[PDB]
RNA sequence: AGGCUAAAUACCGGCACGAGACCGAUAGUCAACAAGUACCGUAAGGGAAAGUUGAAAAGAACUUUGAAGAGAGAGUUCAA
RNA sequence: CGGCUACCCACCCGACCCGUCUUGAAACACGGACCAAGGAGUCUAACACGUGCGCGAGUCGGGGGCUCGCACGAAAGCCGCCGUGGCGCAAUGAAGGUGAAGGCCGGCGCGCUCGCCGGCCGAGGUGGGAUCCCGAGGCCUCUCCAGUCCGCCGAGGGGCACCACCGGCCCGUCUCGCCCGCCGCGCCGGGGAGGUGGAGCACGAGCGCACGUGUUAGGACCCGAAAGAUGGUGAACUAUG
RNA sequence: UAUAGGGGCGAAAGACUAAUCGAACCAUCUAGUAGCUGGUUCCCUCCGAAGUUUCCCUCAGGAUAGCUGGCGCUCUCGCCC
RNA sequence: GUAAGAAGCCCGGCUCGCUGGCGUGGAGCCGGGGUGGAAUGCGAGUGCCUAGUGGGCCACUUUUGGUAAGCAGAACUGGC
């Protein structure tokens, strides 16, 4: 869209939108990130705090494959299973409960949140936070681990 | 060179990249080539099915993917012996033989 | 060749023992047991050596 | 191939018909229906030009 | 190679373009920096206000409504 | 010369809606007519929120639009939203309520009708309530938009609480000088 | 610590080949034409300019000045 | 007869030659003899923000496969038991790891700076806050009764967005403390109460496309150096055998 | 006929080495680099500056504030205070 | 520089592990009551993005170095 570009409107002006005095030449300050310690520190500090230095232990050959533990919340915990199941299991049927397996959906660790309805369920996961374990024992369901 | 509150850029362009640009323009032509190769394979074989060799049932190997299941490579000669059939006879029948696989 | 098999685990009555037992602390106690499996054996060998 | 708004498309998998923004849209009909003209101020039509 | 070193000319006329207004100062001023002993007092004061202030204040509201 | 006062009279308001959308232009025509022929300030606010852009008509969520109608005194009042409605996955149970809004999503219309409600568009809203009698206007979370958690006086100097720009939130990316006391300073 | 092997893959040289929101003779390859030609330098090497009559040569017979170039009449064709 | 005109001429007054560096240009500052054609902020990646559109806690087929070999077809269309994957939905720690619900009432243990139990509601509260609702009273041709109907309302109610503050919750550390749990009784876990660091939560707003602006890397607005490296060609002038 | 470029040769002038020598010529890397000169092409409307603070082997330059413009947004008006 | 009122007054009560002769002090919370509180003028508040700028000079008055300057260097206001 050269016709909508600013450059077609800017013709007829001598400096083309970069000043007569300043004169955009090639590379005024440097290139890229020149002067990170020397003369751009008032940008680097005050706009990127923490850019210089080492912090942590050096870990070699890291895989983003062993540490794979996605989270799922007690809000989302119902809609991994169809809502026909929670309706039928909530329509005063018997003491029984449905089993919701989050490892089928692809979630390993069940974290706690709020608003878990009183309807008791059985959850199978690889990991549990004690928040969500308290919430499940408070609504009356049970915690089950897998492997 | 930098400015107001904007993210630090480190692009990888200092190397003379404009020389070695291989560009996808022959992509529809390769799709037509590979269609004609598959149709030529189907006509050149016989009654034998396309993607002819059968593939096993194989589970991935990472705390991440071990729930899933994958079409593997071959049938792990212990399994192929329990099937009661000889080795290269399975390659002629269309049964994939991969001798490195352990059970 | 995929046919990713899907298990149901339909319905069951909640029982006891489980909902009194299967708490958070099982994972932490097992993890600390796995971390300190060796040093307890070393102190066992020390207690055998001290005669 | 595209369905109605009540049932989904059968040949195309996840696709419904689009949402519809104004349901009935004869603007002359809407402005000359009595429910609006009950609640209008008045036609103010004196011009009141410049007085020398 | 000599230049004009420091001046403050043409500064007031820049400062009074948008205007030298005050720092707003809204209600319920920021409460950081105050005496930590007093703050430890006032937090338990607030939560026990909200704890015990139901019954006797409801009684006194009924009493002042009966009076007036 | 006349005025030693500066020139800054021209307000930077949005007169015509910058979108080219035909249905939105027709709604602009109708509600501009109502805002100049009814003298109800509800029509003024609906007209300005129809002018308003893609960002500042943020989507309402179904749970908030439930909570603002569970307030005392708003049962029969129709909740009117300028902007769109998203279906929520959090709450289970939805009451009967009537909602007039632009472009309600498919699952949200689905579970509103499963609750047994009735939705309307703004032409039907005009044919029912021209002065907007018995309507409660709602608004979306403008400051919850994620770009507003980059805006502050700085990213680090008087604690600033404002999320500096970086590629990947891990170690070794913007954590070292001035974010911890053992390395130089601390904010 | 000995060896072989198709496929999928890269291809601005070549051989033909088809297309183009590309340039239209100061552009596009330097080269639309006797172009790596004329030419410069001892040599390594450097390197151009230069498209268009008319539908058809029908290219002005013949006369008449001038030593001829050149001209005036005449003629060709829709146009000299 | 009327006529502006890029025709020409007369006269009065104003009237220094343009471009740029510059505090300062008519300058005894530089460039411009004249004319025609060419001649300079492009493109990609990446990011940020504003804008428009679609879908919406999702979204995206950009890589493949599917359709008969048909100009436009290097198009378009479909996949969904191709969502693998990207970005987001959850942050925080160097890491081992850990990972966001409270409010209201009834009761008990010494209701003791303290924990437990029972019921219900459900993202707390304060001050502003567009809008909405209610409403004293007020006004419409004889005197009674009438209804919509009419409009202003003192005042009052619930209160969006957002702002300001307090309270709450998670993680890292620090301080002070006691209690519980038992795939096994231990230099083992779990817990409490405060003050702090956090790019947090406190009913989610992104993703894709396109356009605009700005910044960066690229020959990057166009032309410009003295240099350096690689690899070759020259003693026909000259230098000396 | 011999000697070839940081090399040759020099009764020594840093002279000569194909009109070039205090480092020859030709091509390529190469559109090398430049905080430094020069130019930077259509109209109209609206608004409209700065030559100042701090820091930099910075003092012909940049980052930072300040000044400017655009994009809006949230309220206020119209009907004795 | 500050003040020239509803974010303010006045009354009544609750809570506190802070303070302590004292139901004392101080804060917070709740409910109630009465806006007419110098003059003058005006619409204000707020967020994002970011160009150009980072070589100045003169004038009144006050002023530093100098014999002095159309010199160098400052302050307040205006201009260029
Ligand atoms: Mg200009
Ligand atoms: Mg510049
Ligand atoms: Mg800059
Ligand atoms: Mg870097
Ligand atoms: Mg390079
Ligand atoms: Mg200066
Ligand atoms: Mg005037
Ligand atoms: Mg002006
Ligand atoms: Mg081998
Ligand atoms: Mg080998
Ligand atoms: Mg091969
Ligand atoms: Mg030509
Ligand atoms: Mg050429
Ligand atoms: Mg011809
Ligand atoms: Mg003709
Ligand atoms: Mg200069
Ligand atoms: Mg000068
Ligand atoms: Mg000039
Ligand atoms: Mg000149
Ligand atoms: Mg000249
Ligand atoms: Mg031209
Ligand atoms: Mg956007
Ligand atoms: Mg996935
Ligand atoms: Mg060098
Ligand atoms: Mg060299
Ligand atoms: Mg060499
Ligand atoms: Mg010789
Ligand atoms: Mg050399
Ligand atoms: Mg010579
Ligand atoms: Mg260049
Ligand atoms: Mg060059
Ligand atoms: Mg400087
Ligand atoms: Mg502005
Ligand atoms: Mg600019
Ligand atoms: Mg600036
Ligand atoms: Mg300068
Ligand atoms: Mg005087
Ligand atoms: Mg002076
Ligand atoms: Mg001077």
PDB file of N, CA and C (backbone and C1' of nucleotides) in Angstrom, chain H residues 40-41 221-222 224-225 228-235 238-241, chain I residues 1-2 8-9 16 18 24-30 36-39:
ATOM      1  P     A H  40      14.537   7.106  -7.700  1.00  0.00           P
ATOM      2  O5'   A H  40      14.217   7.207  -6.151  1.00  0.00           O
ATOM      3  C5'   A H  40      14.926   6.402  -5.229  1.00  0.00           C
ATOM      4  C4'   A H  40      15.519   7.210  -4.106  1.00  0.00           C
ATOM      5  C3'   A H  40      14.559   8.087  -3.329  1.00  0.00           C
ATOM      6  O3'   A H  40      13.846   7.355  -2.354  1.00  0.00           O
ATOM      7  C1'   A H  40      16.555   9.274  -3.800  1.00  0.00           C
ATOM      8  P     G H  41      12.346   7.761  -1.966  1.00  0.00           P
ATOM      9  O5'   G H  41      12.126   7.054  -0.561  1.00  0.00           O
ATOM     10  C5'   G H  41      12.191   5.639  -0.447  1.00  0.00           C
ATOM     11  C4'   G H  41      12.253   5.177   0.989  1.00  0.00           C
ATOM     12  C3'   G H  41      11.021   5.459   1.832  1.00  0.00           C
ATOM     13  O3'   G H  41      10.792   4.373   2.717  1.00  0.00           O
ATOM     14  C1'   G H  41      12.914   6.544   2.779  1.00  0.00           C
ATOM     15  P     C H 221      18.825   4.236   6.221  1.00  0.00           P
ATOM     16  O5'   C H 221      18.488   4.712   4.734  1.00  0.00           O
ATOM     17  C5'   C H 221      17.244   4.412   4.124  1.00  0.00           C
ATOM     18  C4'   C H 221      17.085   5.101   2.791  1.00  0.00           C
ATOM     19  C3'   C H 221      18.338   5.280   1.947  1.00  0.00           C
ATOM     20  O3'   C H 221      18.645   4.123   1.193  1.00  0.00           O
ATOM     21  C1'   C H 221      17.085   7.290   1.972  1.00  0.00           C
ATOM     22  P     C H 222      20.147   3.805   0.719  1.00  0.00           P
ATOM     23  O5'   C H 222      20.483   4.923  -0.352  1.00  0.00           O
ATOM     24  C5'   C H 222      19.900   4.869  -1.638  1.00  0.00           C
ATOM     25  C4'   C H 222      20.448   5.939  -2.538  1.00  0.00           C
ATOM     26  C3'   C H 222      21.953   6.081  -2.552  1.00  0.00           C
ATOM     27  O3'   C H 222      22.574   5.105  -3.362  1.00  0.00           O
ATOM     28  C1'   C H 222      20.964   8.215  -2.381  1.00  0.00           C
ATOM     29  P     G H 224      29.320   5.308  -3.531  1.00  0.00           P
ATOM     30  O5'   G H 224      30.344   6.358  -2.916  1.00  0.00           O
ATOM     31  C5'   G H 224      31.228   7.079  -3.756  1.00  0.00           C
ATOM     32  C4'   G H 224      31.889   8.215  -3.023  1.00  0.00           C
ATOM     33  C3'   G H 224      32.646   7.845  -1.774  1.00  0.00           C
ATOM     34  O3'   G H 224      33.881   7.232  -2.056  1.00  0.00           O
ATOM     35  C1'   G H 224      31.381   9.774  -1.363  1.00  0.00           C
ATOM     36  P     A H 225      34.018   5.644  -1.899  1.00  0.00           P
ATOM     37  O5'   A H 225      35.321   5.476  -1.017  1.00  0.00           O
ATOM     38  C5'   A H 225      36.582   5.835  -1.548  1.00  0.00           C
ATOM     39  C4'   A H 225      37.041   7.162  -1.017  1.00  0.00           C
ATOM     40  C3'   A H 225      38.389   7.151  -0.329  1.00  0.00           C
ATOM     41  O3'   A H 225      39.437   7.286  -1.265  1.00  0.00           O
ATOM     42  C1'   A H 225      36.812   8.378   0.960  1.00  0.00           C
ATOM     43  P     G H 228      46.810  -0.576   3.016  1.00  0.00           P
ATOM     44  O5'   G H 228      45.943  -1.788   3.562  1.00  0.00           O
ATOM     45  C5'   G H 228      45.967  -2.123   4.937  1.00  0.00           C
ATOM     46  C4'   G H 228      45.016  -3.249   5.243  1.00  0.00           C
ATOM     47  C3'   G H 228      45.172  -4.497   4.400  1.00  0.00           C
ATOM     48  O3'   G H 228      46.233  -5.329   4.829  1.00  0.00           O
ATOM     49  C1'   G H 228      42.892  -3.935   4.555  1.00  0.00           C
ATOM     50  P     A H 229      46.984  -6.283   3.778  1.00  0.00           P
ATOM     51  O5'   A H 229      45.957  -7.467   3.525  1.00  0.00           O
ATOM     52  C5'   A H 229      45.621  -8.372   4.561  1.00  0.00           C
ATOM     53  C4'   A H 229      44.529  -9.301   4.116  1.00  0.00           C
ATOM     54  C3'   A H 229      44.853 -10.136   2.893  1.00  0.00           C
ATOM     55  O3'   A H 229      45.538 -11.320   3.240  1.00  0.00           O
ATOM     56  C1'   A H 229      42.735  -9.119   2.627  1.00  0.00           C
ATOM     57  P     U H 230      46.615 -11.957   2.245  1.00  0.00           P
ATOM     58  O5'   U H 230      45.725 -12.673   1.142  1.00  0.00           O
ATOM     59  C5'   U H 230      44.845 -13.723   1.502  1.00  0.00           C
ATOM     60  C4'   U H 230      43.915 -14.068   0.371  1.00  0.00           C
ATOM     61  C3'   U H 230      44.587 -14.390  -0.944  1.00  0.00           C
ATOM     62  O3'   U H 230      45.076 -15.715  -0.979  1.00  0.00           O
ATOM     63  C1'   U H 230      42.765 -12.931  -1.320  1.00  0.00           C
ATOM     64  P     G H 231      46.540 -16.022  -1.555  1.00  0.00           P
ATOM     65  O5'   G H 231      46.328 -15.998  -3.128  1.00  0.00           O
ATOM     66  C5'   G H 231      45.313 -16.789  -3.722  1.00  0.00           C
ATOM     67  C4'   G H 231      44.963 -16.291  -5.095  1.00  0.00           C
ATOM     68  C3'   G H 231      46.137 -15.964  -5.987  1.00  0.00           C
ATOM     69  O3'   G H 231      46.694 -17.133  -6.553  1.00  0.00           O
ATOM     70  C1'   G H 231      44.477 -14.283  -6.172  1.00  0.00           C
ATOM     71  P     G H 232      48.048 -17.070  -7.406  1.00  0.00           P
ATOM     72  O5'   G H 232      47.545 -16.800  -8.890  1.00  0.00           O
ATOM     73  C5'   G H 232      48.405 -16.203  -9.843  1.00  0.00           C
ATOM     74  C4'   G H 232      47.685 -15.165 -10.660  1.00  0.00           C
ATOM     75  C3'   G H 232      48.562 -14.333 -11.576  1.00  0.00           C
ATOM     76  O3'   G H 232      48.743 -14.979 -12.820  1.00  0.00           O
ATOM     77  C1'   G H 232      47.012 -12.950 -10.405  1.00  0.00           C
ATOM     78  P     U H 233      50.098 -14.801 -13.650  1.00  0.00           P
ATOM     79  O5'   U H 233      50.009 -13.320 -14.217  1.00  0.00           O
ATOM     80  C5'   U H 233      49.173 -13.002 -15.316  1.00  0.00           C
ATOM     81  C4'   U H 233      49.441 -11.599 -15.786  1.00  0.00           C
ATOM     82  C3'   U H 233      50.907 -11.269 -15.982  1.00  0.00           C
ATOM     83  O3'   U H 233      51.328 -11.615 -17.286  1.00  0.00           O
ATOM     84  C1'   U H 233      49.844  -9.560 -14.710  1.00  0.00           C
ATOM     85  P     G H 234      52.883 -11.680 -17.660  1.00  0.00           P
ATOM     86  O5'   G H 234      53.254 -10.179 -18.001  1.00  0.00           O
ATOM     87  C5'   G H 234      54.526  -9.666 -17.662  1.00  0.00           C
ATOM     88  C4'   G H 234      54.491  -8.172 -17.515  1.00  0.00           C
ATOM     89  C3'   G H 234      55.808  -7.531 -17.148  1.00  0.00           C
ATOM     90  O3'   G H 234      56.624  -7.327 -18.280  1.00  0.00           O
ATOM     91  C1'   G H 234      54.113  -6.687 -15.752  1.00  0.00           C
ATOM     92  P     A H 235      58.022  -8.090 -18.404  1.00  0.00           P
ATOM     93  O5'   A H 235      59.028  -7.134 -17.632  1.00  0.00           O
ATOM     94  C5'   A H 235      58.981  -5.730 -17.835  1.00  0.00           C
ATOM     95  C4'   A H 235      60.354  -5.118 -17.816  1.00  0.00           C
ATOM     96  C3'   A H 235      61.481  -6.025 -18.302  1.00  0.00           C
ATOM     97  O3'   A H 235      62.394  -5.276 -19.098  1.00  0.00           O
ATOM     98  C1'   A H 235      61.954  -5.247 -16.117  1.00  0.00           C
ATOM     99  P     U H 238      65.710   3.182 -20.754  1.00  0.00           P
ATOM    100  O5'   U H 238      65.596   3.303 -19.172  1.00  0.00           O
ATOM    101  C5'   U H 238      65.590   4.573 -18.540  1.00  0.00           C
ATOM    102  C4'   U H 238      65.184   4.462 -17.095  1.00  0.00           C
ATOM    103  C3'   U H 238      66.131   3.682 -16.206  1.00  0.00           C
ATOM    104  O3'   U H 238      67.214   4.469 -15.758  1.00  0.00           O
ATOM    105  C1'   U H 238      63.906   2.985 -15.811  1.00  0.00           C
ATOM    106  P     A H 239      68.704   3.887 -15.803  1.00  0.00           P
ATOM    107  O5'   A H 239      68.803   3.008 -14.482  1.00  0.00           O
ATOM    108  C5'   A H 239      68.376   3.529 -13.233  1.00  0.00           C
ATOM    109  C4'   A H 239      68.469   2.491 -12.148  1.00  0.00           C
ATOM    110  C3'   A H 239      69.575   1.477 -12.317  1.00  0.00           C
ATOM    111  O3'   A H 239      70.812   2.003 -11.879  1.00  0.00           O
ATOM    112  C1'   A H 239      67.576   0.415 -11.593  1.00  0.00           C
ATOM    113  P     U H 240      72.112   1.919 -12.808  1.00  0.00           P
ATOM    114  O5'   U H 240      72.772   0.546 -12.368  1.00  0.00           O
ATOM    115  C5'   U H 240      72.777   0.172 -11.004  1.00  0.00           C
ATOM    116  C4'   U H 240      72.911  -1.314 -10.852  1.00  0.00           C
ATOM    117  C3'   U H 240      73.735  -2.002 -11.911  1.00  0.00           C
ATOM    118  O3'   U H 240      75.112  -1.847 -11.643  1.00  0.00           O
ATOM    119  C1'   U H 240      71.786  -3.269 -11.423  1.00  0.00           C
ATOM    120  P     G H 241      76.209  -2.325 -12.700  1.00  0.00           P
ATOM    121  O5'   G H 241      76.511  -3.815 -12.257  1.00  0.00           O
ATOM    122  C5'   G H 241      76.578  -4.835 -13.229  1.00  0.00           C
ATOM    123  C4'   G H 241      76.235  -6.174 -12.648  1.00  0.00           C
ATOM    124  C3'   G H 241      76.633  -7.346 -13.512  1.00  0.00           C
ATOM    125  O3'   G H 241      77.995  -7.685 -13.349  1.00  0.00           O
ATOM    126  C1'   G H 241      74.410  -7.630 -12.788  1.00  0.00           C
TER     127        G H 241
ATOM    128  P     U I   1      65.254 -13.674 -23.714  1.00  0.00           P
ATOM    129  O5'   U I   1      66.143 -13.833 -22.410  1.00  0.00           O
ATOM    130  C5'   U I   1      66.766 -15.067 -22.106  1.00  0.00           C
ATOM    131  C4'   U I   1      67.670 -14.929 -20.913  1.00  0.00           C
ATOM    132  C3'   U I   1      67.016 -14.416 -19.648  1.00  0.00           C
ATOM    133  O3'   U I   1      66.325 -15.427 -18.947  1.00  0.00           O
ATOM    134  C1'   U I   1      69.072 -13.296 -20.005  1.00  0.00           C
ATOM    135  P     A I   2      65.031 -15.054 -18.082  1.00  0.00           P
ATOM    136  O5'   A I   2      65.636 -14.640 -16.677  1.00  0.00           O
ATOM    137  C5'   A I   2      66.544 -15.501 -16.017  1.00  0.00           C
ATOM    138  C4'   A I   2      67.161 -14.831 -14.824  1.00  0.00           C
ATOM    139  C3'   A I   2      66.197 -14.090 -13.934  1.00  0.00           C
ATOM    140  O3'   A I   2      65.522 -14.964 -13.057  1.00  0.00           O
ATOM    141  C1'   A I   2      68.113 -12.767 -14.309  1.00  0.00           C
ATOM    142  P     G I   8      63.427  -8.535  -1.810  1.00  0.00           P
ATOM    143  O5'   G I   8      63.705  -8.085  -3.306  1.00  0.00           O
ATOM    144  C5'   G I   8      63.750  -9.046  -4.341  1.00  0.00           C
ATOM    145  C4'   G I   8      63.773  -8.397  -5.696  1.00  0.00           C
ATOM    146  C3'   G I   8      64.940  -7.471  -5.973  1.00  0.00           C
ATOM    147  O3'   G I   8      66.066  -8.194  -6.427  1.00  0.00           O
ATOM    148  C1'   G I   8      62.903  -6.477  -6.696  1.00  0.00           C
ATOM    149  P     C I   9      67.531  -7.866  -5.875  1.00  0.00           P
ATOM    150  O5'   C I   9      67.818  -6.394  -6.394  1.00  0.00           O
ATOM    151  C5'   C I   9      68.449  -6.188  -7.644  1.00  0.00           C
ATOM    152  C4'   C I   9      68.319  -4.759  -8.089  1.00  0.00           C
ATOM    153  C3'   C I   9      69.094  -3.738  -7.279  1.00  0.00           C
ATOM    154  O3'   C I   9      70.448  -3.645  -7.678  1.00  0.00           O
ATOM    155  C1'   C I   9      66.880  -2.980  -7.621  1.00  0.00           C
ATOM    156  P     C I  16      60.558   8.318  -8.481  1.00  0.00           P
ATOM    157  O5'   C I  16      61.018   7.039  -9.305  1.00  0.00           O
ATOM    158  C5'   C I  16      61.926   7.154 -10.388  1.00  0.00           C
ATOM    159  C4'   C I  16      62.332   5.800 -10.906  1.00  0.00           C
ATOM    160  C3'   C I  16      61.204   4.808 -11.102  1.00  0.00           C
ATOM    161  O3'   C I  16      60.511   5.012 -12.318  1.00  0.00           O
ATOM    162  C1'   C I  16      63.022   3.748 -10.020  1.00  0.00           C
ATOM    163  P     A I  18      55.646  -0.138 -13.462  1.00  0.00           P
ATOM    164  O5'   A I  18      55.207   0.670 -14.753  1.00  0.00           O
ATOM    165  C5'   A I  18      55.640   2.007 -14.957  1.00  0.00           C
ATOM    166  C4'   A I  18      55.505   2.437 -16.397  1.00  0.00           C
ATOM    167  C3'   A I  18      54.089   2.432 -16.965  1.00  0.00           C
ATOM    168  O3'   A I  18      53.970   3.468 -17.924  1.00  0.00           O
ATOM    169  C1'   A I  18      55.443   1.015 -18.245  1.00  0.00           C
ATOM    170  P     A I  24      51.058  -0.132  -3.580  1.00  0.00           P
ATOM    171  O5'   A I  24      51.321  -0.009  -5.143  1.00  0.00           O
ATOM    172  C5'   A I  24      52.116   1.051  -5.644  1.00  0.00           C
ATOM    173  C4'   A I  24      52.337   0.933  -7.126  1.00  0.00           C
ATOM    174  C3'   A I  24      51.133   0.514  -7.944  1.00  0.00           C
ATOM    175  O3'   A I  24      50.267   1.602  -8.208  1.00  0.00           O
ATOM    176  C1'   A I  24      53.025  -0.722  -8.628  1.00  0.00           C
ATOM    177  P     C I  25      48.678   1.398  -8.224  1.00  0.00           P
ATOM    178  O5'   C I  25      48.423   0.462  -9.481  1.00  0.00           O
ATOM    179  C5'   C I  25      48.583   0.956 -10.800  1.00  0.00           C
ATOM    180  C4'   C I  25      48.415  -0.143 -11.809  1.00  0.00           C
ATOM    181  C3'   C I  25      47.085  -0.868 -11.744  1.00  0.00           C
ATOM    182  O3'   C I  25      46.076  -0.202 -12.476  1.00  0.00           O
ATOM    183  C1'   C I  25      48.847  -2.446 -11.798  1.00  0.00           C
ATOM    184  P     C I  26      44.555  -0.260 -11.983  1.00  0.00           P
ATOM    185  O5'   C I  26      44.100  -1.751 -12.304  1.00  0.00           O
ATOM    186  C5'   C I  26      43.970  -2.203 -13.643  1.00  0.00           C
ATOM    187  C4'   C I  26      43.508  -3.636 -13.695  1.00  0.00           C
ATOM    188  C3'   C I  26      42.314  -3.974 -12.825  1.00  0.00           C
ATOM    189  O3'   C I  26      41.087  -3.642 -13.441  1.00  0.00           O
ATOM    190  C1'   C I  26      43.992  -5.617 -12.548  1.00  0.00           C
ATOM    191  P     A I  27      39.807  -3.291 -12.542  1.00  0.00           P
ATOM    192  O5'   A I  27      39.332  -4.694 -11.960  1.00  0.00           O
ATOM    193  C5'   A I  27      38.556  -5.584 -12.741  1.00  0.00           C
ATOM    194  C4'   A I  27      38.499  -6.954 -12.121  1.00  0.00           C
ATOM    195  C3'   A I  27      37.696  -7.068 -10.842  1.00  0.00           C
ATOM    196  O3'   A I  27      36.313  -7.216 -11.106  1.00  0.00           O
ATOM    197  C1'   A I  27      39.759  -8.211 -10.614  1.00  0.00           C
ATOM    198  P     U I  28      35.213  -6.719 -10.049  1.00  0.00           P
ATOM    199  O5'   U I  28      35.342  -7.738  -8.831  1.00  0.00           O
ATOM    200  C5'   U I  28      34.870  -9.070  -8.941  1.00  0.00           C
ATOM    201  C4'   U I  28      35.276  -9.889  -7.746  1.00  0.00           C
ATOM    202  C3'   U I  28      34.719  -9.424  -6.413  1.00  0.00           C
ATOM    203  O3'   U I  28      33.443  -9.980  -6.171  1.00  0.00           O
ATOM    204  C1'   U I  28      37.045  -9.884  -6.224  1.00  0.00           C
ATOM    205  P     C I  29      32.379  -9.230  -5.239  1.00  0.00           P
ATOM    206  O5'   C I  29      32.980  -9.334  -3.767  1.00  0.00           O
ATOM    207  C5'   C I  29      32.900 -10.546  -3.032  1.00  0.00           C
ATOM    208  C4'   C I  29      33.640 -10.461  -1.720  1.00  0.00           C
ATOM    209  C3'   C I  29      33.219  -9.345  -0.779  1.00  0.00           C
ATOM    210  O3'   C I  29      32.073  -9.696  -0.023  1.00  0.00           O
ATOM    211  C1'   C I  29      35.592  -9.483  -0.890  1.00  0.00           C
ATOM    212  P     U I  30      31.217  -8.576   0.746  1.00  0.00           P
ATOM    213  O5'   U I  30      31.247  -7.328  -0.234  1.00  0.00           O
ATOM    214  C5'   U I  30      30.245  -7.167  -1.228  1.00  0.00           C
ATOM    215  C4'   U I  30      30.324  -5.805  -1.856  1.00  0.00           C
ATOM    216  C3'   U I  30      30.719  -5.787  -3.328  1.00  0.00           C
ATOM    217  O3'   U I  30      30.115  -4.661  -3.947  1.00  0.00           O
ATOM    218  C1'   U I  30      32.303  -4.582  -2.088  1.00  0.00           C
ATOM    219  P     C I  36      27.789  14.256  12.506  1.00  0.00           P
ATOM    220  O5'   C I  36      29.002  14.218  11.480  1.00  0.00           O
ATOM    221  C5'   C I  36      30.206  14.910  11.756  1.00  0.00           C
ATOM    222  C4'   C I  36      30.934  15.258  10.486  1.00  0.00           C
ATOM    223  C3'   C I  36      30.091  15.926   9.416  1.00  0.00           C
ATOM    224  O3'   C I  36      29.926  17.314   9.631  1.00  0.00           O
ATOM    225  C1'   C I  36      31.345  14.171   8.450  1.00  0.00           C
ATOM    226  P     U I  37      28.667  18.081   8.996  1.00  0.00           P
ATOM    227  O5'   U I  37      29.167  18.489   7.548  1.00  0.00           O
ATOM    228  C5'   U I  37      28.236  18.804   6.532  1.00  0.00           C
ATOM    229  C4'   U I  37      28.923  19.059   5.219  1.00  0.00           C
ATOM    230  C3'   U I  37      27.999  19.225   4.031  1.00  0.00           C
ATOM    231  O3'   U I  37      27.490  20.539   3.929  1.00  0.00           O
ATOM    232  C1'   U I  37      29.738  17.723   3.472  1.00  0.00           C
ATOM    233  P     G I  38      25.936  20.780   3.624  1.00  0.00           P
ATOM    234  O5'   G I  38      25.721  20.119   2.198  1.00  0.00           O
ATOM    235  C5'   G I  38      26.230  20.750   1.041  1.00  0.00           C
ATOM    236  C4'   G I  38      25.987  19.930  -0.194  1.00  0.00           C
ATOM    237  C3'   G I  38      24.547  19.559  -0.475  1.00  0.00           C
ATOM    238  O3'   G I  38      23.825  20.607  -1.088  1.00  0.00           O
ATOM    239  C1'   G I  38      25.914  17.665  -0.748  1.00  0.00           C
ATOM    240  P     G I  39      22.336  20.940  -0.607  1.00  0.00           P
ATOM    241  O5'   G I  39      21.450  19.793  -1.254  1.00  0.00           O
ATOM    242  C5'   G I  39      20.942  19.946  -2.566  1.00  0.00           C
ATOM    243  C4'   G I  39      20.476  18.635  -3.129  1.00  0.00           C
ATOM    244  C3'   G I  39      19.094  18.182  -2.699  1.00  0.00           C
ATOM    245  O3'   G I  39      18.083  18.741  -3.522  1.00  0.00           O
ATOM    246  C1'   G I  39      20.641  16.391  -2.518  1.00  0.00           C
TER     247        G I  39
END
